[PDB]
């Protein structure tokens, strides 16, 4: 290698998620174990975030900061009424965002 990232990130497996914002931007509660055909599974999410800005970017031309993007995993979330399966947002990476400066 001898290669480096523009934005540094740290990833960890999260097994105790309790809240998250859905694919509709609506915040919501996330349950633990789920029941899929008489068997119970733990809900696990591999989460990745930033530490910000960017490294190696030509400052003399662009403005930049590090942003954490996200994927969408289907999970069991209690909205208030009943539990339902919906796609939640999960921090998955850190990318540098560019913006023409001056």
């Amino acid at each position: 290698r001898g290669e480096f990232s523009v934005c540094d990130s740290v990833s960890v497996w999260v097994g105790d998620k309790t809240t998250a914002t859905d694919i509709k931007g609506k915040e919501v509660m996330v349950l633990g174990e789920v029941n899929i055909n008489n068997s119970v599974f733990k809900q696990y999410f591999f989460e990745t975030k930033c530490r910000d800005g960017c490294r190696g970017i030509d400052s003399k031309h662009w403005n930049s900061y590090c942003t954490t993007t996200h994927t969408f995993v289907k999970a069991l979330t209690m909205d208030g009424k009943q539990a339902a399966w919906r796609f939640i947002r999960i921090d998955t990476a850190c990318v540098c965002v560019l913006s023409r400066k001056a």
Partner: protein
């Protein structure tokens, strides 16, 4: 009619085997074989065996962190947490080395790999002590700017 199990019941029946994700509740002896599914996060069976029960999912203890969660058909995997790496002969997690000021990242500190540092070469510096920052290219003050401080391997140049 081949006995894909090599195991027989008390009357010549080739014991059935507990497939992937299922363990052996009770060993075939007087009767066939009793298989029950393993528990997600608790037990797994990555083998189609007529003699193997659901084994206990490996747990990450101490400085060990989950790198892979346990499924009913696959054990979990554990690696040394973010700030550490695994020492080869000891198997113990040791805190990553840091590239001190005037020194920079070459190779990241991950799992079995401890941080590989570098004394900053001609033209670069390292402002901090950590294991993520590589040596950076010096700022070149303008012909019109007052070089308040020059670039050394440990501090970048300053201007006005």
């Amino acid at each position: 009619e081949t006995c894909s199990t090599g195991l027989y019941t008390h009357s010549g029946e080739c014991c059935k085997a507990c497939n992937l994700g299922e363990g052996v509740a009770q060993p075939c002896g007087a009767n066939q074989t009793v298989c029950e599914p393993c528990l997600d996060n608790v037990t797994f069976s990555d083998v189609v065996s007529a003699t193997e029960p659901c084994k206990p999912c490996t747990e990450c203890l101490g400085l060990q962190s989950m790198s892979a969660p346990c499924v009913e058909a696959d054990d979990a995997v554990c690696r040394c947490a973010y700030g550490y790496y695994q020492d080869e002969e000891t198997g113990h997690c040791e805190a990553c080395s840091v590239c001190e000021v005037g020194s920079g990242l070459v190779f990241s500190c991950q799992d079995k790999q401890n941080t590989v540092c570098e004394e900053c070469p001609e033209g670069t510096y390292s402002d901090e002590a950590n294991h993520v920052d590589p040596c950076l290219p010096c700022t070149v003050c303008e012909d019109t700017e007052r070089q308040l401080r020059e670039c050394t391997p440990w501090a970048d140049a300053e201007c006005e």
